[PDB]
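User: My advisor, Dr. K., asked me to get a structural model of this assembly before our group meeting. I'm new to this, so sorry if the format is off. These are the inputs:
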Amino acid sequence: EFDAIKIALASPDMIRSWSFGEVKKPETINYRTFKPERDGLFCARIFGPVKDYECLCGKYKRLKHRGVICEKCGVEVTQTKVRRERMGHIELASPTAHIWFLKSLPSRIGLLLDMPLRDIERVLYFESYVVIEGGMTNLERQQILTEEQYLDALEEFGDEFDAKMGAEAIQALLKSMDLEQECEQLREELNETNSETKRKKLTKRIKLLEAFVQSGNKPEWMILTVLPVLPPDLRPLVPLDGGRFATSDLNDLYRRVINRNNRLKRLLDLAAPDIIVRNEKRMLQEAVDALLDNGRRGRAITGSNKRPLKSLADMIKGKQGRFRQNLLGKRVDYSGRSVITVGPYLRLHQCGLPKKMALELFKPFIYGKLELRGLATTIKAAKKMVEREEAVVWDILDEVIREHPVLLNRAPTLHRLGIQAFEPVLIEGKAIQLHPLVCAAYNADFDGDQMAVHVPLTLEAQLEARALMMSTNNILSPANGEPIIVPSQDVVLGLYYMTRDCVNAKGEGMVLTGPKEAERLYRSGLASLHARVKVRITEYEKDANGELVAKTSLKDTTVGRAILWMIVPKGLPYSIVNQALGKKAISKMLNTCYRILGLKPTVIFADQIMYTGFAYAARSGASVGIDDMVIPEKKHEIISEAEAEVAEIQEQFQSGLVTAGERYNKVIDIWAAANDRVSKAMMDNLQTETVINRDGQEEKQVSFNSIYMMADSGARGSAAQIRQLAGMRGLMAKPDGSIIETPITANFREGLNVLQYFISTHGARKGLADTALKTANSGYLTRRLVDVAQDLVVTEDDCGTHEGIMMTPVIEGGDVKEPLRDRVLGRVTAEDVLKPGTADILVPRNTLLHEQWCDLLEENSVDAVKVRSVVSCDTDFGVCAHCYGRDLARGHIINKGEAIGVIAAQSIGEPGTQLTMRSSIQVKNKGSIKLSNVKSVVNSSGKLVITSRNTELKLIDEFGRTKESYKVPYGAVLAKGDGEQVAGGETVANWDPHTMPVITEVSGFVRFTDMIDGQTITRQTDELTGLSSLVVLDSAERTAGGKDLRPALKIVDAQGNDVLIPGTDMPAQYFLPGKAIVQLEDGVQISSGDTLARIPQTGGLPRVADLFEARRPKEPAILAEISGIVSFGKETKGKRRLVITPVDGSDPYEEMIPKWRQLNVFEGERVERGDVISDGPEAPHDILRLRGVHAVTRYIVNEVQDVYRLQGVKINDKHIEVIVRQMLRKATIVNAGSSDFLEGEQVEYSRVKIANRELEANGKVGATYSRDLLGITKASLATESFISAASFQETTRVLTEAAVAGKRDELRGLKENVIVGRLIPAGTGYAYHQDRMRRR
Amino acid sequence: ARVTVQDAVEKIGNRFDLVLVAARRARQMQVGGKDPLVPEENDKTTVIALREIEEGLINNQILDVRERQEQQEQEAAEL
Amino acid sequence: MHARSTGSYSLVTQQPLGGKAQFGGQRFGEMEVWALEAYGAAYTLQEMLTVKSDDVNGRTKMYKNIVDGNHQMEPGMPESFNVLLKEIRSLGINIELED
RNA sequence: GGAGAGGUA
Ligand SMILES: [Mg+2]
Ligand SMILES: [Zn+2]
Ligand SMILES: [Zn+2]
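Assistant: The format is fine. Below is the predicted structure of the whole assembly, which you can bring to the meeting.
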């Protein structure tokens, strides 16, 4: 029906139009006869009848009289639903101001009338007069006055000038203004004189003004004159049932304001003294303010318990507001709640269900089936029958359940898998059984976690469940292709124990004719479950085109492995079942099985895996005993030695030979060494303890100690826990982060003494508190994240572009942190790659890089690839399929319609809980050395000294693919040149990390040019040694005498003329800065590359929070704003000044630099844009504006993925790239051209992108935009749809602005569609929604 | 019994329109007085429609053809 | 262990009550809405937050349909949205639906 | 119906 929503102001006329009467009495209810009052706050004649088709006086009480009114009550005989839709109005004796439009921050009234808010508040609160016109006299349009000022002004100038005080005066001012005329005047004024801050102020004011005329709103409407009132039913008066009623504070606010209004009415009738009416008007204004929004004034109001009342402005804000409480999340019928148990006998696609809950839920279906069977020819008898659950009803239930899925949910549902469909199976219990494998997906322990049950009613819901949410359809995490049904902890133990081998077990060396014989032998007990035996088997290899070629062989394995092989499906290599089968092995096995034989074989194989694992784990009887905690024998000796070692250091400090801090550090170091030794010793003594005769004399093997089996298998616990159990549990850190010198030397097999346990308790409490706060914050983070990227849906197939990004394997100075093969897996190419047979088209330019092509790349050792990203897709209000890539939830390209944004947000947000809250180059491989960004010279020793900063060293292998990479520090000596051969362990470079030299380039004399002792330099000759030394002073250190001169040293020669820079015609002179200590002399030879002088020198979840929020850093390492030569200007005006000058372009750009910044460059250097001028963090906004988009996005993804992988969590880059695309969704105009956009306008990037695009089809020139980046919390607010923002936080701010703008929402986003409850244009509903869109 | 939908998705490689076409068929079957094309085994209508989709004898195109044909028959049945 | 098929109804907003003390129903929370959005599931979400909870006439006729063995629904509009609309209009804001 | 206190995952 309706399509759009419109919002604007309301004139008092319109308010009356809505109204169905006027309220006049603050009385509500008689408390003796519970009918309402005559025309009180509740009333029938105004609102409507209380009972359906019932006159209040009951003169007529039947539907026959529908339409008529009573003559005793004037009440309309009709339904009582009218009592939920009728609105009354209140005639306010005096004008009053609307609180929102006053303290909006910015205040629309304030800046509109252009008065400081303080003055306005003074006027409105009856403490300062203000002239309306004040013409024909000394006064101006809107001069203010105090009280004495006002009386004096009227005394001296008792002429017609008028100065009022309050809402009436404000209303007169507003209504007495011409908008468009002021608009013209203000635009002319802002034309120039002056764009310093008046630029911003005038632009904003003109924006508001042109907005006003653009809407059909009149400014004076901000001043309330008639007050609407809510329908009575929406503020119902619930009885407390003790003969009294509840509070219902809204009604108290209403009665209070009514009392003020009537009191003022009386006083005005009586023409009381002006002081009294002024006080009462102030009181009424305050009451109105409280009603609209209590608390924004300096003092809220409370009835009892000192708790502020609930204003209308409170019914919307916060979690309890309607949006987030009843309008976005709701309670729902047809639901259940219970505890959960395992019941491992279930299939993966079904779950247990109690009889009682099942019977309760499906009651309507039961009624329908009973009536169809005819056993109950009514609903009441049927209800009776089900109420007493005759035996028949149970088979009916079984019939109804036959193929009806249901939904299971766990409370903290982070990611998509947190809720899933299942088929039900009835059970005579009261606990929901649950197939154990899904527990990992639900992250659901059985320590008493509860689950909730829902049922899909309509047919389409059932089909959606079966075809999308069935458990068997969700096996790969969307975050990454990794499976998500890993045999978690017990089955894995069983399997690992199965696929082991004792050196000499019962029934060894014999031969078998197939796994069935192995099973029979083991069941008869004639052989141990794991002993080496040769057995014949048959592999099935489908290398042919979908043709399973069988091939037999006689392998040699252990009986347990052979028995296990019976389960695996046809097409797999037997080698996959020939190892110890750790957890990783099982996961990889499942992954490969799915990748080869599709879906169904994989799931059935998993079920059999689980069954067998449980059976044989139970058979194993692997228990834990105290004897298993084997303490290493040498531990005591090691500890004693370490203690004796500590003693000598303590002695050395006693004599004072050593300081305290070094004592502390060495103590810690030796303690760590001893602890490591103990750990290693116990681990060795444990893992290989088993020594067994082999039927020869003796041997050894891996151990069967239950603890080690559990640990190595990966079922539970890393090495750290077992170390604590057996070995000393290391050092503990005290609250402030310090580490206690004395470690805990006791393990848990032994008992800790008091103090040790005390310290450990401290640590554990720290951990627990951190966990609590971490989850608390992570919830908020993810809530923010999803809000900003909920509108994005793939809606196209191909946008038809060629831009992309060069995906390359990540290097961190060290090895490959992640090979290229996994960064590009499953993303279409932009431009075809050419093999290193260059001119060899290896792949097409628009093919999907599935596994085989990745293998092709790997065997061809490709370095970097142009891949189509999502940040550049040319689709408007969406993204074409190719720009995205594969689904990553199933092996094929993404479908058309998917809501990728939401799943990406969920994938990013879910893992947050696991995070934490609070010299020389030594190459190590033989290969070719290569160097990039090389601006270097040869020094006196023949080695190579660099003079560029971003110089980078690569070690490439013989084939030619890069293998290692390292950052070259500035001014580092290098043994080699470029393109040499290095040996493993060959130190290739060295440098000083401490001080900064004044390295030169060429040999010759050095002359102290423009250096006079007294005002430029000081003769601070070294006294310890006696060599010549003179120090150039800083600006502050130098006296005023030598400020104008610029000390420098120009390379000279014997003849005395200046030497020339190599290559360029400019003369060579190093400008010595302040505090330039020079030990050289005048006219003295120095060789190439020599220091002429010397000058001295978080990662937690909040890191991600800030980075996505795009908050600026503490110390922003300034960058090269543009290219060109650098120079200085007026100095020490609190800071230095710098000016850049292009070779030819203009050069108005200068900057003011804090004195603390150690600029590495000098004025004599021409520098290109982007180059670091200071050192430290970097601001993304400048990165964008100076290096386009592909730079900022790459930086962001690198940073975030670094943080994530540091903790060991796998996430695909697409989910981040989509976020970035949303982040940078805006733009700002630089030049309209033939467009129609004002200059400073910030406009949606899409609108301009299509406007210019179509204008060029005409002979018109578009505009010149410039993209922009915003924190998510800002971008989510600067969205076309205002409802989406309103459901988000700070409803008042967005809503007031939108109402003033008179915005008009069209509802094509998701969240809003949810609000109004219609099919989402995302999933299945996408087809219908697009179809309906096409219908118009 | 029905445990997977992989074959149906193979017949219709989108996984969304599958739901809609199956729903329309099952709606014809349940409230509309129609009959199945596969021998049912005491199974509900949704699974039956899904199996029909699986065997490929019913897809969106054939459904459009059938609805148009029966519409023409009804328009020819009024006389 | 608790269940509810169809019980009472909150007064100001027409939704199922909460808590075991009353015969209330569960709360389909916001995160679960997100999760359903993540799947392609659209119909089920729409029904769950339109006819199973809020729209009076929708659920009445749905009850009749279910009794009559005809699984179909008529969405209509949530009442709580009208509640929000009236509440906003109580302020000086004139808000409404277009054509 | 709303407040406050406590408690579970
Ligand atoms: Mg638990
Ligand atoms: Zn009457
Ligand atoms: Zn694209």
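One thing worth pointing out at the meeting: The helical segments of chain C are 30-38, 43-50, 56-67, 79-90.

User: Perfect, thanks a lot.
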